[PDB]
Amino acid sequence: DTRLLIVLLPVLAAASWALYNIGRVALQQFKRL
Amino acid sequence: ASLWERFCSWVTSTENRLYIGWFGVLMIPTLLTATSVFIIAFVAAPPVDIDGIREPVAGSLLYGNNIISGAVIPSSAAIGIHFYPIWEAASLDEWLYNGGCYPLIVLHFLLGVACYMGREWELSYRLGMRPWIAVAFSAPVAAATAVFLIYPIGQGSFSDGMPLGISGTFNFMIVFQAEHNILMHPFHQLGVAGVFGGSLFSAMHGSLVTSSLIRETTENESANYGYKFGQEEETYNIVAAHGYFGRLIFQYASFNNSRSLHFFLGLWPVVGIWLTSISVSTMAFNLNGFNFNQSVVDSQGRVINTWADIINRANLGMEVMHERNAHNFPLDLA
Amino acid sequence: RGWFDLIDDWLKRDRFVFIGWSGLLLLPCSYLALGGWLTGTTFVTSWYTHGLASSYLEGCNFLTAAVSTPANSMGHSLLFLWGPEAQGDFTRWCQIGGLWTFIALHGAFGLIGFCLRQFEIARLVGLRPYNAIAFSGPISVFVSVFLMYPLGQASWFFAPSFGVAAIFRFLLFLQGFHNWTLNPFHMMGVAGILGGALLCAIHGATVENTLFEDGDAADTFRAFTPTQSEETYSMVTANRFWSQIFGVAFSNKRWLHFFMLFVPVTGLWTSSIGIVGLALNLRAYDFVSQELRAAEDPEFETFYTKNILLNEGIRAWMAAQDQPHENFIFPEEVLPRGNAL
Amino acid sequence: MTPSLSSFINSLILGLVIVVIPISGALLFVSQKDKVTRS
Amino acid sequence: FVWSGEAYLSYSLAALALMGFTASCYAWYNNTAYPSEFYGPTGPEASQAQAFTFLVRDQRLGANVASAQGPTGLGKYLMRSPSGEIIFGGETMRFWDLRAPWLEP
Amino acid sequence: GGMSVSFPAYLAVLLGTFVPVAFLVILYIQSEARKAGASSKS
Amino acid sequence: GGMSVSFPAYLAVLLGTFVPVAFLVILYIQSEARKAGASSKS
Amino acid sequence: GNPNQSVTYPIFTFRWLAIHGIAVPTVFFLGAITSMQFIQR
Amino acid sequence: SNPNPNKQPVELNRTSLFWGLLLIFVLAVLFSSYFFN
Amino acid sequence: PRSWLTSSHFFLPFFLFIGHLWHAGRARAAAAGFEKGINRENEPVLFMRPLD
Amino acid sequence: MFTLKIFVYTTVIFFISLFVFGFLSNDPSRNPNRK
Amino acid sequence: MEALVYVFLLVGTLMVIFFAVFFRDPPKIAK
Amino acid sequence: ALRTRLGEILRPLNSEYGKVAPGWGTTPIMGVFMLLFFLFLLIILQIYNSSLIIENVDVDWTSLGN
Amino acid sequence: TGRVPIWLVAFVGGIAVIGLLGLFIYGSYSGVGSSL
Amino acid sequence: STGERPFSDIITSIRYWVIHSITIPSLFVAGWLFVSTGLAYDVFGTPRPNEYFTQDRQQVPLVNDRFSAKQELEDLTK
Amino acid sequence: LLFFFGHLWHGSRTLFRDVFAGIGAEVTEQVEFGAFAKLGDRTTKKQG
Amino acid sequence: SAAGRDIESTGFAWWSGNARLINVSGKLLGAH
């Protein structure tokens, strides 16, 4: 269990950088339609 | 106007029913004596000592041998790759016991398709067109050189070549995969991707033409009667068959240039059979396939078998049982 | 408007990849079969199934790695993850061999979803349905070698395992134990596949060779727009060339491309008819006219009679290693060796 | 009542619950975004 | 001939194909221009050294090495060539025309 | 001096040949006789 | 429990029937297809 | 030549989801297969 | 017992004969060795 | 090293023969004129008598 | 048996000298587009 | 006894090769 | 068109060609019965395959024994 | 200029294809499954 | 020609490399720790190269029962 | 197995009955990409 | 002067773009 969150922690680091640059512009899409 | 130029303009004349050009001065008499010896020695040849161990193999129609068992048997291994014509025999039936019919067919057939390949160039010159159908026939000619000539050159005798028969080709393939591992060779691997891939693209391109035909025909009659031969316009929408296949995979995975599409039909099986014909000829000089026997070992050093070992237990079982009394020493041609 | 008519408007809309109503069956089932092979070739062993290490995790490359067939011990089981064999546990279900029936059932429901897709594109754009018909060859090999061949046999063990070298067992498995090559339905199939590889090579390299000088450049690939009315190649010259080189030649471009449909598919459908008969051991093994003769004449020999002895070499040497559940404990004196090796 | 029987009925719920998500996910994706002049 | 640049290449590719096929059969058969102490033994003489090293071993066990009575009725160790020379028996009778510097004495 | 084969298979091959061979020669000759009846002597 | 008859005579009867039977069905179908080509669609 | 300066375009299309089904397992597995071969027995 | 309107003639050109004469012969080339056994 | 030198010297000079068949074809088709394709204004087959 | 070697080598040289003297007799002028 | 069947079938399919080349339906350009 | 004594008593059976029910009809009634038949077909497939071993149902050849 | 070239994104993605396939041939001569 | 943002005007954009010049390594690193922290052997049942054999089990492991294979594979490792 | 093909042929035939002689002239403008929102629907002519 | 380094300066495309040196003898000598 404890090594599962060593694998998914770069995945959580990947989506955190993805939701930093897109979270202004992904809010534009869901409010548009 | 000369006595030769009047003959020289008949050979290179396109008015004949079959083109009889200057390569056809060599392939017509060589194939017709590779036909007349093949038809006679399939029916009424005597049994042939193929291995040179004085045990003849009876592969003609008189001696039993329904046609998924009969074969023009290869030469004797005591002869080897020595030149064995009729006049270097003491008698004609002594020539038949050592298997003289196999180099008389296969040196005339190989010289006949080499001048079929030049004749396929030659009509593309006198008709005024692009000439590279000789290049596309160089994939079967090399593959007929690989099993018939280059594998007897590398492996010694003419008995190692492919027997001219249906069950002889299945015996040639099992003995090959015993000693050369063609199934795990990465150039035969490309050839079956040009054989399955070529069979894919025949069933793919031939489908998309016949599924997008414009109806110059009625309902009850046949569809093929709507293409008048020698017409100017295309009989099928290339833009609709591209818009079909651009919806099937995605839009840019499909050639709406029909010349680059049709070149890809001439590139995928022809390069693949070029790589098969190399592989059998590089295995003729015993550069075999991949050998991952006993590669996976654990920490104690005990051998763990992989899937290449169960191929090898097949490869070893057809190794001990082929040529069942022709071996006297423990290693096969080592 | 509507509710069911709404979902038909969205699912059949024009996008980069097309979903369609077949995409509710194709796009999940193609994903878990193509992806389920790629995660068992990467990680999942076969050590408790066959005694074989076959994955990239335990030291195999792209050739010698597979999701292997489940067991003889299970025996025709569908092998669900929730099933009675491997109840709930994912790690046991990978170890029993249950990924093979995860792939071969999603593959058998994905090829339904792709052939329903080829019906759904050709109906929407307005074409004829001759691509779902030509795909019925590849359906009838997957439904008859991976499903109808092991279901008649003993278990899922004797099926082809999804891997590169594990198929190369199955070709030599049907040579030694079945004399597959002498089967005339397979010999109908070799002349369908090597005939289709001829027709793709000889038609593709004669319309790149009898084509009209439409452009002015040295390369000819630029001289074609898709929406041109005129023919991009000369049918009369290509008819003239093969009438004198070969002797026969096509005169119908419309019949020519149907012959490129019929020769691979009716070659692939005929060899599928034979391997249905190979599930029942209704094989074309031996010529009984020549086995009576070779027993009643100890100097009668043919390449057929040499092919039978090669099959008893394959079936007696591989049997201790291929089927380890049977416990074949053949000593070294009783298996058929030849002489000196 | 058998554990091989109750695992099948639990598979019918788990087949339903996970694959009601493309039933509703292809229903939210159309009532928020649809074609302009059609059915 | 044709007198152009694509022509003069094409004459030389057919000539280099003739030399490249010849240089293969040099490397597979010759052991004098391609000596065996550097390139290894050739295709024939590997198959003839095996018949030689078991002609030695069973002679060292006291057999008359001629009159072998091999299994097919022919010579096991020593045999007769089709032209009538005394050659090595077995499968290696196809390589009977071997000239190799360790057996030519 | 002999090869014991299946005696009904001479009927399986020759009736297996000459019944569908005669089916195609039935269909071909009437197809050209319909062309000869329509083009000529119309 | 058996009657030893001549084994080539199964080929003498059935090819002796189906070769001249197929000769007359070849000639009859083209005779009516020539009538159908001449009377209709002239 | 220049970037698309002001034209509107959706970012989470279905072509985004169709690629990331085959790309995000790929860059996970490459790197898992790369780490398998430094493993000594 | 009126005259039928739905009757239609059957065509077969010489190409379709030569394929059918080739096919029925080659299937008899192929399967004769297995029928004779 | 004989088994590499002989195997690769089928790989090179067989392909070196294939490009000779490419270039003996192309040089005699470029010197004659029909290297970019069949001339549409006069193709030579349409000015020939047919086969039979 | 020697008489066949005299007869084959008559025939093999006959089609070879038709081959060599055939392609020497102005073969690239046998095209279309004027000669 | 049965080799007569194989020689008849192989010559009899070699005549259909002969008749399809020289006695073919002659393709003539749609006038 | 010939009208006989048998074709006159079978006349209202071959009468209403193309006389459908409007709209969606009994299609949600049909989709329940198609689902229940498919749910029936997965049960007896798993009974045969011994993935659904139920009490007092033995799928051995010894079921019809003494 | 706010843009990467198309040939540059295929170049550094092209070296890594040779880079990953370079490690797959090295890893077949080392470690587990290399007959060592 | 479909109405959405094109492919090659995404790959060339500077936001695309500002978002995942890191998450193409961050999936490569997450794949690396899946096969190096012992998780790839455990959740897929693959044996470690010292866990092929066992001091109590020198032979090869093969499943024998079908329904009690959960009880057998538990008693086949350790 | 052979009846699986003929069902797949006849199910291809009973749906595609009007294109059995071949496709018409209405196909060319309804196929090319991005013209319509819903594929095969000429009432969705996206535009402007 | 200078000649032939494009598609529509010689006819050959880039994959054939080694055969723009047939009628160019100076670059061909530096190519050899």
Ligand code: CLA
């Ligand atoms: C000289 C080359 C040559 C020739 C002529 C053949 C010919 C044949 N092979 Mg064969 N084969 C070859 C090389 C060759 N093979 C090689 C190199 C291999 C790999 C080792 C094989 C492997 C192989 C397998 C595995 C099988 C065949 C089969 C066949 C038969 C049908 C082929 C088919 O459907 O393909 C497509 C055919 C065409 C596109 C054109 C038709 C060509 C005809 C059939 C050739 C007839 C040749 C015959 C001798 C008659 C010549 C007439 C002449 C004397 C006038 C045919 C007898 C199959 C078989 O057993 O069927 C009996 C089969 O299963 N072959």
Ligand code: CLA
């Ligand atoms: C009192 C109630 C009752 C009882 C006791 C039975 C009893 C039975 N029914 Mg039954 N039935 C009933 C009511 C009942 N029925 C009613 C009310 C209906 C609705 C009309 C049906 C409809 C029905 C059908 C349609 C079938 C049965 C079958 C059966 C038999 C199952 C055992 C067997 O051999 O199946 C063995 C058969 C199966 C398990 C079927 C599995 C088929 C799978 C799902 C699909 C296989 C083909 C598919 C295309 C895959 C091809 C791929 C290939 C490569 C594998 C058994 C005799 C089956 C039968 O008689 O088969 C012998 C059957 O097919 N029943």
Ligand code: CLA
């Ligand atoms: C001395 C040998 C020689 C010479 C000088 C030429 C010269 C030429 N050829 Mg030619 N050719 C040759 C041998 C030769 N050829 C051989 C051996 C073949 C058979 C394979 C061909 C087949 C051939 C074709 C089919 C064509 C030419 C063309 C051309 C012209 C342009 C070449 C070009 O742009 O390629 C640019 C180079 C490339 C695009 C790269 C190709 C790379 C190949 C596919 C892979 C090579 C694999 C190699 C063994 C190992 C590589 C290692 C790998 C890890 C990277 C030029 C006049 C063209 C032409 O007609 O122009 C007039 C043309 O279309 N050639």
Ligand SMILES: CC(C)=CCC/C(C)=C/CC/C(C)=C/CC/C(C)=C/CC/C(C)=C/CC/C(C)=C/CC/C(C)=C\CC/C(C)=C/CC/C(C)=C/CC1=CC(=O)C(C)=C(C)C1=O
């Ligand atoms: C004494 C003797 C003879 C001894 C030999 C004994 C012996 C070896 C006997 C065996 C012989 C034999 C025939 C065995 C066959 C085996 C067998 C069982 C066959 C069954 C037949 C079979 C597979 C039926 C299923 C249907 C099917 C899949 C058929 C495949 C068809 C096939 C094999 C080949 C067709 C492919 C082919 C040759 C195409 C050539 C096309 C071509 C050049 C067309 C001309 C042309 C080309 C163009 O490109 C253009 C543009 C135009 C315009 C044009 O016109």
Ligand SMILES: CCCCCCCCCCCCCCCC(=O)OC[C@H](COP(=O)(O)OC[C@@H](O)CO)OC(=O)CCCCCCCCCCCCCCC
């Ligand atoms: C020595 C010089 C070279 C001579 C080579 C001679 C070889 C001649 C081969 C002719 C085959 C003709 C077959 C009839 C078939 C025939 O003639 O059909 C005629 C047909 C004509 O096509 P069309 O353009 O006229 O089509 C229009 C009609 O179909 C419209 O409905 O040609 C073809 O379909 C393509 C032929 C493919 C190639 C034929 C198959 C090759 C396999 C042959 C089988 C060999 C068996 C050997 C057993 C012993």
Ligand SMILES: CC1=C(\C=C/C(C)=C/C=C\C(C)=C\C=C/C=C(C)\C=C\C=C(C)\C=C\C2=C(C)CCCC2(C)C)C(C)(C)CCC1
């Ligand atoms: C079964 C399972 C699952 C899952 C599935 C999935 C999700 C999968 C995925 C998968 C993925 C997602 C991926 C994988 C893999 C991939 C890969 C492995 C890729 C790639 C590689 C390659 C491709 C190689 C090589 C190359 C390159 C690099 C490029 C160029 C070419 C070549 C080929 C050379 C589930 C959940 C259902 C549940 C149960 C279990």
Ligand SMILES: [Cl-]
């Ligand atoms: Cl030996």
Ligand SMILES: [Fe+3]
């Ligand atoms: Fe086409």
